[PDB]
Design an enzyme around this catalytic site. Sequence first.
Site, PDB file in Angstrom:
ATOM      1  N   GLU A  91       0.793  -1.229   0.000  1.00  0.00           N
ATOM      2  CA  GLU A  91       0.000   0.000   0.000  1.00  0.00           C
ATOM      3  C   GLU A  91       0.833   1.291   0.000  1.00  0.00           C
ATOM      4  OE1 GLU A  91      -2.824  -0.588   3.260  1.00  0.00           O
ATOM      5  OE2 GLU A  91      -3.974  -1.935   1.992  1.00  0.00           O
ATOM      6  N   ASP A 140      -8.798  -8.594   3.693  1.00  0.00           N
ATOM      7  CA  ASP A 140      -8.625  -7.502   4.653  1.00  0.00           C
ATOM      8  C   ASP A 140      -9.764  -7.422   5.686  1.00  0.00           C
ATOM      9  OD1 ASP A 140      -7.799  -5.332   5.940  1.00  0.00           O
ATOM     10  OD2 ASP A 140      -8.452  -3.891   4.459  1.00  0.00           O
ATOM     11  N   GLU A 198     -13.471  -1.434  11.684  1.00  0.00           N
ATOM     12  CA  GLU A 198     -13.304  -0.835  10.361  1.00  0.00           C
ATOM     13  C   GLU A 198     -14.382  -1.289   9.382  1.00  0.00           C
ATOM     14  OE1 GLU A 198      -9.362  -1.382   8.489  1.00  0.00           O
ATOM     15  OE2 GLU A 198     -10.137  -0.497   6.670  1.00  0.00           O
TER      16      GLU A 198
HETATM   17  O1  LIG Z   1      -7.265  -3.374   2.177  1.00  0.00           O
HETATM   18  C1  LIG Z   1      -7.479  -2.213   1.416  1.00  0.00           C
HETATM   19  C2  LIG Z   1      -7.366  -0.969   2.260  1.00  0.00           C
HETATM   20  O2  LIG Z   1      -6.059  -0.834   2.746  1.00  0.00           O
HETATM   21  C3  LIG Z   1      -7.730   0.259   1.503  1.00  0.00           C
HETATM   22  O3  LIG Z   1      -7.618   1.391   2.386  1.00  0.00           O
HETATM   23  C4  LIG Z   1      -7.171   2.506   1.637  1.00  0.00           C
HETATM   24  C5  LIG Z   1      -6.229   3.279   2.543  1.00  0.00           C
HETATM   25  O4  LIG Z   1      -5.792   4.476   1.933  1.00  0.00           O
HETATM   26  C6  LIG Z   1      -6.810   5.338   1.719  1.00  0.00           C
HETATM   27  O5  LIG Z   1      -6.308   6.523   1.155  1.00  0.00           O
HETATM   28  C7  LIG Z   1      -7.725   4.759   0.700  1.00  0.00           C
HETATM   29  O6  LIG Z   1      -8.739   5.719   0.490  1.00  0.00           O
HETATM   30  C8  LIG Z   1      -8.299   3.426   1.160  1.00  0.00           C
HETATM   31  O7  LIG Z   1      -9.061   2.873   0.087  1.00  0.00           O
HETATM   32  O8  LIG Z   1      -8.991   0.153   1.026  1.00  0.00           O
HETATM   33  C9  LIG Z   1      -9.142  -0.903   0.114  1.00  0.00           C
HETATM   34  C10 LIG Z   1      -8.858  -2.226   0.769  1.00  0.00           C
HETATM   35  O9  LIG Z   1      -8.794  -3.171  -0.274  1.00  0.00           O
END
Ligand SMILES: O[C@@H]1[C@@H](O)[C@H](O[C@@H]2CO[C@@H](O)[C@H](O)[C@H]2O)OC[C@H]1O
Lengths: 708, 708
Positions: free
Chosen positions: A288, A361, A389
């Site tokens: 990420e 997740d 969450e």
């Molecule tokens: O597991 C994934 C999450 O980590 C993801 O969370 C993201 C975190 O950063 C934010 O800026 C985003 O808006 C947000 O989508 O979400 C998707 C999920 O697949």
Amino acid sequence: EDGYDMWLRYQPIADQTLLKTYQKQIRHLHVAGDSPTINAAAAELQRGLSGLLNKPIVARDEKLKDYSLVIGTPDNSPLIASLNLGERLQALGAEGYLLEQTRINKRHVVIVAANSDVGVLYGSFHLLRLIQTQHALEKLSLSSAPRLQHRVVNHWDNLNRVVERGYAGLSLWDWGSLPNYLAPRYTDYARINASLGINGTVINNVNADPRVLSDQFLQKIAALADAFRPYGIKMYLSINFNSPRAFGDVDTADPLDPRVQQWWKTRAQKIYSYIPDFGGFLVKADSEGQPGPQGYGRDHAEGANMLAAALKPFGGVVFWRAFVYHPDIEDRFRGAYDEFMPLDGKFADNVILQIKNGPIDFQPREPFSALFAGMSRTNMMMEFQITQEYFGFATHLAYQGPLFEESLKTETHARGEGSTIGNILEGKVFKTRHTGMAGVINPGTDRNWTGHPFVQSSWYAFGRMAWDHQISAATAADEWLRMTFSNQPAFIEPVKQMMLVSREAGVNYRSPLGLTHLYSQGDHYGPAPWTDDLPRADWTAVYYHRASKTGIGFNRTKTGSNALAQYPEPIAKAWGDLNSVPEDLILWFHHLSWDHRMQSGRNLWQELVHKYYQGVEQVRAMQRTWDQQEAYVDAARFAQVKALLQVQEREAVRWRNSCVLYFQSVAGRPIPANYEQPEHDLEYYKMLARTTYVPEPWHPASSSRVLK
Amino acid sequence: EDGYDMWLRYQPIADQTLLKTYQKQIRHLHVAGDSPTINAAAAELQRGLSGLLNKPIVARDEKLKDYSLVIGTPDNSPLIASLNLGERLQALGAEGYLLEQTRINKRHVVIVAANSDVGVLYGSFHLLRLIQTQHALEKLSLSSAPRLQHRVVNHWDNLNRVVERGYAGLSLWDWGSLPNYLAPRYTDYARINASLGINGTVINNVNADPRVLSDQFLQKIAALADAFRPYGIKMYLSINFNSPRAFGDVDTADPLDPRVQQWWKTRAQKIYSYIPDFGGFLVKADSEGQPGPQGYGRDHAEGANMLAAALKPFGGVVFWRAFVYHPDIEDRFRGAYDEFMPLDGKFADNVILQIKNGPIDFQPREPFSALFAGMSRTNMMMEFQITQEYFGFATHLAYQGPLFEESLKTETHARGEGSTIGNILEGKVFKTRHTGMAGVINPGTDRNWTGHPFVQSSWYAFGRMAWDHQISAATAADEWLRMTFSNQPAFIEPVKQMMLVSREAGVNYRSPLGLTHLYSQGDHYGPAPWTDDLPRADWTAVYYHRASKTGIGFNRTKTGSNALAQYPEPIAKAWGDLNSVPEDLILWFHHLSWDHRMQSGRNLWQELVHKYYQGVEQVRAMQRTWDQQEAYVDAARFAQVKALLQVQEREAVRWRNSCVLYFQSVAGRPIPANYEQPEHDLEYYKMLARTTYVPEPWHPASSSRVLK
Ligand SMILES: O[C@@H]1[C@@H](O)[C@H](O[C@@H]2CO[C@@H](O)[C@H](O)[C@H]2O)OC[C@H]1O
Ligand SMILES: O[C@@H]1[C@@H](O)[C@H](O[C@@H]2CO[C@@H](O)[C@H](O)[C@H]2O)OC[C@H]1O
Ligand SMILES: [Co+2]
Ligand SMILES: [Co+2]
Ligand SMILES: [Co+2]
Ligand SMILES: [Co+2]
Ligand SMILES: [Co+2]
Ligand SMILES: [Co+2]
Ligand SMILES: [Co+2]
Ligand SMILES: [Co+2]
């Protein structure tokens, strides 16, 4: 009652016959030891027994009196040593304890014996819990020892004090007044976690801030460590893998570069000078957008081992998270297993791979992470989510006990029958060096720590199961309800059942039958099954359910992504055959036509509608259940939970209408007439998704000024 | 003691002789009325009297008993009416009250009498205060009426619940659980403010979010208004001038466009349907990038009157802020006066111009805003800051009483002697219709509401001064200490003097002698007197001090920017002559050579250094003072204030060193040898400014990962 004490409510035992019995049994508190940990135990017993028994019980080192509670180890209490408990006590190890009604020098006494001081503290908390839950001390003889080594909590706290996926206020850590101000709350936090046997904590976000390793912050963190120490809790920190560069000391963070290796060795020395028993590091890397080894063309074993080598001389460990998934793969589900299986056996002995319960997740229901049954030469630990969450922030009631229980009792067949997730974690399946589980709690400065009162029950359940993975959701809830609210049988049974159904309700109104990942992105509060067109497809909703006019679900069998082949043969067989795959997981593995007939007799479209509507009905039933409890709960918490349930009902209706109408628009099938047709159309629910307030300070959606 | 009760601590009176006297005088509580406001008063007196007198005092409506506290109006209490108070009650108006020991049909009584129910409530809180401060009830005969109409607080709360310039936690308003959950804290917030006589609150950020005008949020806000109403507190909202555009209803926000006029009138109707006694609007426009009439080539009268036309049929008002200044003027000091003077008399009768105490931005000392002495045909109100944006967030002790008093007692000479700011605000100088004072409090969810315990003292003083603008900082501190901590004279005297010097200490270690605006931008926590090169120069530090090798200060006399000519003749004279200008303001108006000799005998450089070192010494003296109070204060608050004072001393030194070393680097003069020379150089303090943690969730600086 404002929830500050959580489950440590030391109020007089309500049952007067029972109170008298305890009063006759525990008349004095005998503590010979005087180490910080023993002092913490004595202090808890003193406040706890005095409150519960409604009379002044003071911990004293004096000649043993009749009807005493005597605590200690053979090393610190001559009285305990005199019993010559031998092998019986010794088998309980470095954290276990024995609680027993017995005699010493003819005196009636109840002993909290252990081999260590922390063992006495854990034993002391259990002693109190027995009373809190109105269990009898007569003929007491029980021993317990934790089944996992690292039992930790995780806080996704940013240094500005905003918590990521934090629905219960600001971070508890008041950096501006640390180290100078040792707030009482830091000690109460320690007492909460010690009460469950939790022995470690990662206080900062996995999206890690390099500042935590500077002297400025290490001084602050050390003060926290000091407050937590007497309660057996080690300090851990999440680290940023690019730290050497963030501090401007090295022009790379490549783990094979000698200067990088040296940077971390020197930094570990600095940490350990501040916190001599520092636990180690949690690492989110190459996931990420977070920095990691692969950014320098290295693997995860190479990165983890470099960090591990730095901590090894000090006895520290690296908790390296397996929550990794590249945007380019064909199926996200497959990601972690395909990344880490080739590295099995390559991690140093003080590296532990921290794996979420499922491959995606933290979704309301996921199948078990395949890595658990696959990695046979690497230390593993579980990561569960407590903060809601995906279960409705601080407005939705959702006991997570059952989610954790479901996971821990899942048979994986890794090495035949008996290869449950819990048994794997304990080390019984593959022989392993380090074991554990981590729980992402994300509490905050709200008076009741968790925002929603019932998030406390999840905290609790998590802590209990980390101690013993076979403890059921039902057992944990019974205990929690008695400690938190009431010991009245008429209250416990309905409210326990309500708690037990809450998780499933949360599955049902969001994404039943193996559906998943239908949340508004990226805040995760509300429904948004139509999500598409995101930078990465595996962050959308359509990617997962693949709904069309003809069918729905994701093919993970041999004819699809073949993720089933990452599981042991018996699981692959069971889940790949339509005859044996559990319906509560079916759409994870199979793309099925809308006319497929389910066990109930309904077709898949019908069953989807039925489940969504069931979830809302389950919340409405929770409302009715809670309303019947007004006589057993204090007026304030009663009113708060009642109100929150109204909010949850409203949102569950929004979730139900949004999802059913969305899948209807794709399937082109009617909602059966026996179900209440949604108040409005699909465009209205899209508009509601754009405008309905997102109740979390952290996610940017809470600042969204979109009004249409 | 965790500060949740603030100054409403109803603990038994410690002086036993005194306690007996109160117990003999108030044996019963007689309340005939039953309106929501009277019920709230009765409830307050019941909990308050019971706690303070250590015996059950229950509000009852019964045949009058001997030694009763009797409350009501002539309209709701026959007993009060039977006293035929006449002219005595008439002079009290709509919010005043009479407190009096007297007789009704032979029965010894104390009355709380007023014309309205809110007047009874305010009188009830004063009666409690008398007891809380150990004042004698014998021969009691007093009356009071507020001197300002609109006594309000302001909340710079964002709807994500992050507070802008918020050092005390998240916003109190839990939007996710509203309107369903009527939290007890909403009522306690109302009690706190009603105790001071505050009758209005603006709950949302002046950097305004248009969502507050939507049905979604109006339903939530109405539940807050409902909770506040029995306490006499009206609801107000900050508005975004571009709202018609943000809602997607009109393509402009121009106030002269009939569609825009109609949008606001229709929106006002909507607001009043939810909240029929809605107070009105707070407006930040054409300031710091916020939208406004000038964005449409219109003026502030045109913008304000259009909103005022919408509120007029409902009795609402517009609080229009004069905090405006554009980047390309010669001197920001002149800004507001040059903006608003040409509009004097052009504002509608239900528009009030809300003006900060000084022309810049709440700096530790500013001369009075020239607009107060210049606008003669416009309603005006004061804006004071309580939250410590510029006084050290939640870590520095800085009682603001002396700042508010200094401002309110400032002679302006606008229309003869006695043209004090206070007298102008009261409406006596210029004969205006609507009067008031607003206080930016920015409290949050922290248990003690204000973060730093002493910020409560500043909220307290503000409210007392809003009721009576001649109340001294000394009097407000005396009351607050007694209510919050102790009635021991040996404690009150030194802690009162410590409070009284704290403001001046905060001036001394930051920016003495008329220096100003030396803060790190734009968080405002720490020193940064070198700050230059920002998108606009009036946001920097060099812009204000203009330091060079030959001198320092800003020339605002006739040979400079001639801002003094914006003041009444006598003020311009006094401040423009070096013989008569106060040294505490001198550098605001004069650029002086470093060799200028001050009243003390020191040259200006020497005096500069002396003041900066004095501020640190004053903080050290505060530490020593507070340590002497350990016997009088509960252990928890004692420890917390002790620790915060240590953080404040460390910061005061950092401020002192950074500023003295910066001005030395410009002046090229030595620090006199009797002072402790800083060991590090200026570059080190620049480094500390880049890396020292900024303790506020809101400002981006708290997330800064700069490490060098
Ligand atoms: O597991 C994934 C999450 O980590 C993801 O969370 C993201 C975190 O950063 C934010 O800026 C985003 O808006 C947000 O989508 O979400 C998707 C999920 O697949
Ligand atoms: O009065 C001015 C302040 O309003 C200003 O504060 C700014 C607020 O917006 C933030 O985004 C900026 O960072 C901050 O500087 O600072 C200067 C002061 O003169
Ligand atoms: Co609670
Ligand atoms: Co953040
Ligand atoms: Co139920
Ligand atoms: Co059908
Ligand atoms: Co306090
Ligand atoms: Co914000
Ligand atoms: Co002092
Ligand atoms: Co000199």
